[PDB]
Write a protein that binds this ligand. Structure first.
Ligand SMILES: CCCCCCCCCCCCCCCCCC(=O)OC[C@H](COP(=O)([O-])OCC(O)COP(=O)([O-])OC[C@@H](COC(=O)CCCCCCCCCCCCCCCCC)OC(=O)CCCCCCCCCCCCCCCCC)OC(=O)CCCCCCCCCCCCCCCCC
Ligand SMILES: CCCCCCCCCCCCCCCCCC(=O)OC[C@H](COP(=O)([O-])OCC[N+](C)(C)C)OC(=O)CCCCCCCCCCCCCCCCC
Ligand SMILES: CCCCCCCCCCCCCCCCCC(=O)OC[C@H](COP(=O)([O-])OCC[N+](C)(C)C)OC(=O)CCCCCCCCCCCCCCCCC
Ligand SMILES: CCCCCCCCCCCCCCCCCC(=O)OC[C@H](COP(=O)([O-])OCC[N+](C)(C)C)OC(=O)CCCCCCCCCCCCCCCCC
Ligand SMILES: CCCCCCCCCCCCCCCCCC(=O)OC[C@H](COP(=O)([O-])OCC[N+](C)(C)C)OC(=O)CCCCCCCCCCCCCCCCC
Ligand SMILES: CCCCCCCCCCCCCCCCCC(=O)OC[C@H](COP(=O)([O-])OCC[N+](C)(C)C)OC(=O)CCCCCCCCCCCCCCCCC
Lengths: 105, 95, 70, 165, 315, 116, 100, 341, 67
């Protein structure tokens, strides 16, 4: 993992050096009032959305749920088979029943 | 001693995040972000505890599930005041 | 006609073939063994530790000539 | 050594987390603190499973809600100060040279890694991330993870009710 | 600990980064060339000889133009998105299955899911700091589709990990010594193509970064080097998805030249679906990511739970 | 923890000639080593697992080391070049020392052992 | 371990969650404490069973061993600062890499 | 509070989480149950018709998660010092555990969130708050053996909870301040018994159900609103208001019994000064109980004449009149009780 | 009918439900096949596992040929 830190810091250093040299190599012109303006098509110029927030919340709940589906590949050769099967079938079946119930309602 | 050299830093940063949680110079979003900062420090200290034991590290995703549900609960409490208190309630310095 | 795509694709086949094949040369140059030792299982790491304990190069072999005559 | 570097980075990011006030900037400080917390909890452990779990759950899974809410909360940009950057760099170089002049054997953690264990330890040779995750899927502690999945579904039911949709 | 391991790991990683970047440039050339041949028209030509240095004509132009800003006062947050985007696109390649050892990633799928989970973060800072309503809409739409198929991608790769029994990417090689996984996982092949064109913004999932409904989603204010780094990061994501299709489904075959021929062929397939399909909608893409692909993911994960239990009794 | 009351063995008792072979020379020729040296390995590991005492069955550990040395000297007397080629192909075959990458020299080594 | 107030069916899952009983360096010490807490109870086990409490805390808490290690390392540095020990003999003969 | 079946679901999961809290044999599974109880008590205490309920739920969230993280941090610190859940000699980490529990329960150094949240709720979520949500922290307080924190909390609870309810003319804040004083009698019983606490808590819960049902059926939120409350017979209004004299601890009614059992057990445990400090500071509680009883003990009032029919629920008031009878005639059942011994 | 409507509107979910039912059936088949023989006594143990002849576990070892 210590080599991963060194190579990630080297990628970050190389990208910042490339962008700094690109900013030096960029052609410096006179800065303007209208050039700095945010682009709206043509003529010059959002509230909170709850639907996207519950999309993020559904993503979070399913992400923490996936983080419990993640370990059981390793445990299948090192656990009780009946307990592992009962928990896996119950886990994915309650997930499917909840998904279908939230679809129907 | 053992407390001074080992696991002293999560205590200090936990008290710093607690003081950022309750200071009157901050706002509600800063309270929630400092709350997840002390969630991270709690994970650090809990993992230092759980790694004295060999094979009980599986509890780390239980506390993670509960505190992440706490954080989503706090965000959904805080944004439920958008349609009632307006969009300017995030800058409130007092409750 | 349609064979002008192959200038733009076969080069892609060459460049991505570089970072393994050059290493399959380069590990044969400074190590002498073409494959670096796999560190996945703990037993492989312990036996690699044993090799680097025995010789300063862990990929240098201690064969049957190391055994004294008795 | 690199554990002390992560100590210094967490101290520096925590004191700049205390200093700043812009909410997306605190969110950025949290997302760059979570990486160092993941690595530093990876230094004590046998294998990096729980650092990955904390990574997907906290940073990529949960804090994107915080980044979205703090992005739509603040209209304005960051006011970058070179004074705070210089102070953070000065305390970072001071804490790295303090870790240079300090013995790293006494400052290392007592928690055993996968290679810090004994060679005659039978359990360490079996399979990486096997015995620690075993109690999740065995009797009688499987009821907790069944209750956790039920808890996440019940959490979603709570969140739909309290936001009023 | 032996220092030539560090030296050769550094040399191999830097050589991988250099070859990935030049393959990104030639992938832009290949996409402009055969994407023209999707229609009747020709690709690039007339620059240098037969259009070969056209991406270097792009690189000289994009590194010389005026670095404009979405506001004049404070724009350091505008800089940090292409840096982290190219950093993640060059950092995700470290979990490639190398048979000669470069990095012993025993958990490579989790590393891939981590870098994909940062993809939402770099596109969110791309959207917000560009100070435009088009930029915020494109950033929110890209974050929406990428977290919508993040859960699906995690479940699909989680179903694939049940076949090899571990998280080690090189274990895809030993289970493909007799046949490829394209035979056994062909609906998973179509679903994985729909996944890999969703995390990376391509034409079938292009409501995030299209030129029709928005002028550009999150590259609307990015130009003169930042657009170059973003473009190189996105094409490196395309190259990574082509490689990851070629490891899981097609046999890993890391040494053989046929593996890199198949990687160029899956890049050709990515440019082939670039020219064919129209673009989905927001409501239909929420229908696709959370109902159809999620139901298929959980169902066929149940199928491999039953199959791996059935083979465990027989073996 | 080690005090003056605990009776550690002397360093002269621990001065035993050790099996100083590499990983490729231990992975190759292992299947003939275990069958020839199964009488002492099982007793020594039963000593290590039952008593869980490092000071106990040190004579069993010395017997395991001497039996492995005797087997490797017997291999050195008769089949030396074949075992050297087998260990060389086992180390140069792949990263981990896997037996399935080259089976061509394993057959020659087993033929040498079967003939001698 | 804490005695719960009520003994319902809902303590059956929480009780086994953290315990040294799964393979550990000295869970066999903890069992020798825990059965003692079945003998005298929780409150008489704090007084009559104090010798078996300190061994388990010494084993998994690692208090006096780390304190002795820090006493042996700070005394060596104090001898270095006081001029008694200096040069290449500051550190002793290092152990072998597979010794522990 | 039964407008939806989802609220019944939240009620049974908060019951499950509280039972997980009070049956946990470790200091971390108790925190797990505390988070389950918190998750199921956030949607209750929140409604669309009342504006103050959302910010009151925000106050509840910040107060509980501040208290739960300090409870987790100190429990992990105790486990880092000594690896069993108990402690031989009591130290400062048990003090941090008990202070984090006192922020959860609402003892008077940490009680300032309690009536300030109570100022904007309904009378059924208040019934859940002062009764069931006091189960989860108080049952963990019994596991610790430090005396001076309980002493300071009991003394501060009986002076601050009694004096502070005098200025309040809102019924919810007055009932919150009265529950703060009745909290201190429960912690004073916790230093001497784990059964006398159950006696006081069960009958205090009983008095809370029968007294908050008077303000929930007829929708009473003010002291002046009690004077305008129309009952068809003024003898019935006089009889129904005897639950205030019952809960204040007067000898012919019930509610004298648990306070009397606390007095009996504390004097037998040689604690006389703290008992005198509580009972000189419980007369103020009967004073703001008798200030409510101005609206019924006189037999005629200057009523507003537009309302001439008393409107009420059927099932809830049928459950109310059973419990009102046992609130004032329940001292006849002392011969049948055997749970004091 | 009802299955014709589900096969008309949502055929991938019907095929996935058929695959999940088949996986549940062969999961129960695999559990019954694992517990029909001595599946709790695996043939190939990890680590170095030795039993003396006085142990009760030494009488339950498998002498089957390698498959
Ligand atoms: C030998 C000794 C010689 C003398 C040394 C003197 C040192 C002290 C005086 C210089 C100094 O610190 O001035 C403070 C002066 C005041 O800065 P500030 O107001 O505190 O904060 C910076 C603004 O927020 C920045 O606002 P902005 O958004 O307009 O910034 C433009 C941006 C433009 O950035 C670039 O052009 C960089 C291109 C990308 C680089 C890679 C990614 C980052 O410039 C930088 O980021 C500068 C670096 O800062 C600088 O001059 C910065 C450069 C040093
Ligand atoms: C900025 C960060 C971008 C996102 C990086 C995600 C990396 C994956 C998360 C993680 O904890 O990875 C553990 C991994 C370690 O993975 P591992 O421990 O599973 O792999 C074993 C290590 N090797 C391969 C060498 C044998 O650590 C990293 O990826 C380090 C990231 C450093 C980031 C530096 C900038 C900050
Ligand atoms: C190391 C870089 C530190 C940058 C920093 O702290 O900038 C200050 C600013 C502070 O933003 P601010 O607007 O909250 O400033 C309030 C703090 N004072 C006035 C003391 C400066 O932070 C950023 O711009 C965050 C950038 C991303 C950090 C990750
Ligand atoms: C430092 C590196 C400097 C050389 C960089 C490469 C420049 C190559 C170049 O511009 O070639 C195109 C130009 C000519 O191409 P062109 O793009 O101007 O025109 C193409 C020709 N028509 C339009 C008729 C189809 O080459 C030259 O002008 C001479 C190149 C000499 C060799 C340079 C290095 C090649 C590698
Ligand atoms: C794969 C990535 C490749 C990245 C680099 C691609 C291009 C490399 C080859 C071309 C280099 C061009 C360098 C100059 C770029 C800016 C041009 C410009 O306007 O310069 C004006 C500036 C200033 O000239 P000026 O006086 O006209 O500018 C005043 C400002 N305006 C324009 C508004 C009137 O020129 C220089 O600074 C001279 C630089 C000489 C050295 C050039 C670099 C050598 C090393 C490479
Ligand atoms: C070398 C190959 C050359 C040829 C191919 C070249 C390209 C490479 C592959 C590219 C594939 C396409 C990528 C982009 C796809 C874009 C379209 C898209 O996303 O469509 C989504 C669509 C959307 O579904 P839809 O069409 O129902 O929805 C639209 C219609 N409405 C909204 C009205 C309902 O399809 C799916 O999602 C289908 C599900 C996944 C695939 C099927 C898996 C089912 C399970 C396996 C079989 C089960 C058993 C069956 C037998 C037994 C039955 C009892």
């Amino acid at each position: 993992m210590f080599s991963i830190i060194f190579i990630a810091l080297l990628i970050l250093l190389i990208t910042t050096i490339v962008m700094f040299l690109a900013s030096i190599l960029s052609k410096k012109a006179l800065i303007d009032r209208e050039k700095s303006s945010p682009f709206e098509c043509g003529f010059d110029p959002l509230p909170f959305s709850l639907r996207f927030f519950l999309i993020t919340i559904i993503f979070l709940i399913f992400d923490v749920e996936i983080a419990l589906i993640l370990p059981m590949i390793i445990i299948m050769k090192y656990s009780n088979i009946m307990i592992w099967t009962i928990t896996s079938i119950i886990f994915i079946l309650i997930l499917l029943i909840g998904l279908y119930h939230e679809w129907n309602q | 001693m053992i407390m001074i050299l080992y696991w002293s830093l999560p205590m200090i940063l936990f008290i710093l995040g607690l003081f950022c949680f309750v200071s009157n110079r901050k706002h509600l979003l800063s309270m929630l972000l400092s709350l997840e900062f002390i969630v991270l420090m709690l994970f650090f200290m809990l993992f230092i505890y759980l790694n004295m034991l060999n094979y009980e590290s599986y509890f780390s995703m239980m506390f993670l599930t509960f505190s992440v549900c706490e954080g989503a609960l706090g965000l959904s409490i805080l944004v439920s005041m958008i349609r009632t208190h307006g969009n300017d309630y995030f800058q409130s310095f007092s409750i | 006609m349609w064979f002008e795509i192959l200038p733009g694709a076969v080069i892609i086949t060459t460049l991505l073939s570089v970072p393994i094949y050059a290493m399959y040369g380069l590990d044969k140059l400074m190590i002498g063994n073409a494959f670096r030792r796999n560190m996945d299982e703990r037993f492989s790491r312990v036996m690699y530790q044993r090799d680097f304990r025995l010789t300063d190069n862990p990929y240098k072999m201690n064969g049957l000539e190391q055994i004294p005559d008795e | 050594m690199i554990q002390l570097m992560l100590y210094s980075l967490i101290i520096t990011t925590s004191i700049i987390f205390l200093n700043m006030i812009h909410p997306l900037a605190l969110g950025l400080t949290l997302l760059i603190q979570t990486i160092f917390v993941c690595l530093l909890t990876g230094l004590m452990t046998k294998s990096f499973w729980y650092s990955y779990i904390l990574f997907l759950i906290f940073l990529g899974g949960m804090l994107v809600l915080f980044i979205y809410v703090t992005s739509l909360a603040s209209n304005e940009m960051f006011n970058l100060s070179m004074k705070l950057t210089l102070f953070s760099s000065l305390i970072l170089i001071f804490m790295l040279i303090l870790s240079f002049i300090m013995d790293k054997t006494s400052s290392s953690l007592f928690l055993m890694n996968n290679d810090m264990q004994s060679i005659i330890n039978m359990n360490s040779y079996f399979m990486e991330n096997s015995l620690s995750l075993n109690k999740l899927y065995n009797f009688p502690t499987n009821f907790i993870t069944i209750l956790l999945m039920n808890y996440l579904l019940i959490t979603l039911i709570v969140i739909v009710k309290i936001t009023k949709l | 600990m032996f220092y030539m391991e560090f030296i050769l790991s550094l040399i191999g990683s830097l050589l991988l980064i250099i070859c990935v970047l030049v393959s990104v440039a030639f992938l832009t050339l290949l996409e402009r060339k055969v994407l023209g041949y999707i229609q009747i028209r020709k690709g690039p030509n007339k620059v240098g000889l037969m259009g070969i240095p056209q991406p270097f004509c792009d690189a000289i132009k994009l590194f010389t133009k005026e670095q404009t800003y979405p506001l004049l006062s404070n724009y350091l947050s505008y800089y940090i998105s292409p840096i982290f985007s190219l950093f993640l696109s060059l950092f995700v390649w470290m979990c490639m299955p190398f048979f000669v050892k470069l990095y012993s990633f025993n958990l490579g799928g989790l590393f891939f899911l981590c870098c994909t989970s940062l993809g939402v973060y770099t596109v969110m800072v791309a959207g917000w700091s560009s100070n435009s309503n088009y930029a915020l809409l494109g950033g929110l739409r890209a974050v929406a589709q990428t977290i919508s198929y993040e859960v699906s991608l995690a479940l699909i790769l989680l179903s694939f990990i049940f076949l090899i029994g571990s998280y080690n990417m090189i274990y895809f090689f030993f289970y493909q010594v007799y046949m490829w996984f394209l035979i056994i996982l062909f609906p998973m092949a179509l679903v994985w193509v729909s996944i890999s064109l969703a995390e990376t913004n391509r034409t079938p999932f292009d409501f995030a970064e299209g030129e029709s409904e928005l002028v550009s989603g999150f590259n609307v204010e990015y130009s003169s080097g930042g657009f170059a780094l973003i473009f190189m990061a996105e094409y490196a994501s395309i190259l990574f998805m082509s490689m990851l299709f070629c490891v899981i489904f097609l046999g890993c075959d890391v040494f053989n030249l046929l593996f890199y021929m198949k990687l160029t062929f899956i890049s050709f397939v990515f440019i082939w679906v670039r020219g064919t399909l129209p673009r989905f909608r927001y409501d239909k893409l929420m229908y696709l990511a959370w109902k159809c692909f999620l139901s298929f993911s959980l169902n066929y994960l149940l199928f491999f739970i039953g199959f791996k239990i059935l083979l465990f009794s027989l073996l | 923890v080690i005090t003056n009351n605990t009776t550690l063995p002397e360093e002269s008792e621990l001065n035993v000639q050790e099996l100083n072979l590499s990983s490729a020379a231990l992975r190759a020729g292992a299947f003939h080593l275990g069958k020839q040296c199964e009488q002492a390995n099982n007793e020594f590991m039963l000593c290590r697992q039952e008593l869980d005492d490092p000071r106990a069955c040190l004579a069993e550990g010395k017997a395991v080391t001497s039996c492995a040395l005797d087997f490797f000297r017997k291999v050195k007397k008769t089949c030396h070049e074949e075992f050297t080629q087998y260990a060389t192909c086992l180390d140069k075959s792949s990263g981990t020392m896997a037996f399935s990458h080259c089976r061509k020299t394993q057959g020659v080594f087993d033929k040498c052992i079967k003939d001698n | 371990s804490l005695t719960p107030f009520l003994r319902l069916p809902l303590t059956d899952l929480t009780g086994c969650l953290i315990n040294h009983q799964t393979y550990d360096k000295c869970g066999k010490f903890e069992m020798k404490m825990m059965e003692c807490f079945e003998a005298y109870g929780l409150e008489r086990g704090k007084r009559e069973c104090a010798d078996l409490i300190s061994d388990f805390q010494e084993c998994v808490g690692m208090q006096k061993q780390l304190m002795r290690f820090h006493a042996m390392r700070n005394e060596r540095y104090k001898q270095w600062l006081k001029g008694e020990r200096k040069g290449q003999e500051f550190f002793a003969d290092p152990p072998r890499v597979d010794a522990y | 509070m039964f407008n939806n079946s989802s609220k019944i679901l939240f009620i049974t999961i908060m019951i499950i989480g509280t039972l997980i809290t009070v049956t946990s044999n470790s200091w971390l599974g108790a925190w797990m149950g505390l988070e389950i109880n918190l998750l199921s008590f956030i949607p209750l205490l929140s409604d669309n018709n009342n504006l103050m309920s959302t910010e009151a739920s925000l106050k509840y969230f910040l107060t509980q998660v501040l208290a739960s993280t300090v409870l987790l941090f100190s429990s992990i610190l105790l486990m880092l010092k000594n690896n069993m859940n108990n402690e031989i000699n009591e130290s400062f980490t048990s003090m941090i555990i008990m202070s984090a529990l006192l922020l959860k329960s609402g003892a008077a150094p940490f009680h300032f969130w309690f009536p300030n949240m109570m100022e904007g709720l309904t009378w059924m979520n208040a019934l859940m708050l002062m009764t069931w949500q006091k189960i989860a922290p108080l049952m963990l307080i019994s596991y610790l053996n430090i005396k001076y924190l309980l002493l300071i909390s009991v003394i501060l609870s009986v002076i601050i909870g009694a004096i502070g309810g005098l200025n309040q003319t809102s019924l919810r804040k007055l009932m919150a301040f009265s529950s703060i004083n009745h909290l201190g009698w429960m912690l004073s019983s916790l230093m001497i018994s784990e059964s006398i606490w159950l006696i006081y808590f069960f009958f205090y819960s009983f008095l809370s159900f029968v007294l908050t049902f008077m303000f929930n059926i007829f929708k009473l939120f003010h002291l002046n609103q009690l004077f305008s409350w129309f009952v068809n017979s003024k003898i019935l209004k006089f009889t129904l208001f005897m639950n205030f004299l019952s809960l204040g601890g007067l000898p012919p009614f019930l509610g004298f019994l648990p306070k009397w059992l606390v007095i009996q057990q504390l004097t037998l445990c040689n604690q006389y000064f703290m008992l005198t400090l509580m009972m000189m500071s419980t007369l103020i509680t009967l004073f703001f109980y008798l200030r409510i009883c101005y609206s019924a003990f006189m037999m005629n009032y200057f009523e507003n004449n537009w309302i001439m029919k008393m409107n009420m629920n059927s099932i809830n008031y049928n459950m109310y009149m059973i419990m009102t009878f046992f609130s004032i005639f329940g001292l006849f059942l002392i011969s049948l009780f055997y749970f004091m011994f | 009918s009802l299955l014709k409507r589900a096969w008309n509107e949502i055929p991938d979910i019907v095929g996935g439900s058929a695959l999940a039912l088949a996986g549940i059936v062969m999961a129960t088949i695999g559990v019954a096949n694992y517990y029909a023989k001595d599946g709790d006594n695996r043939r190939y143990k990890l680590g170095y596992v030795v039993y003396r002849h006085d142990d009760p576990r030494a009488l339950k070892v498998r002498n089957d040929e390698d498959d």
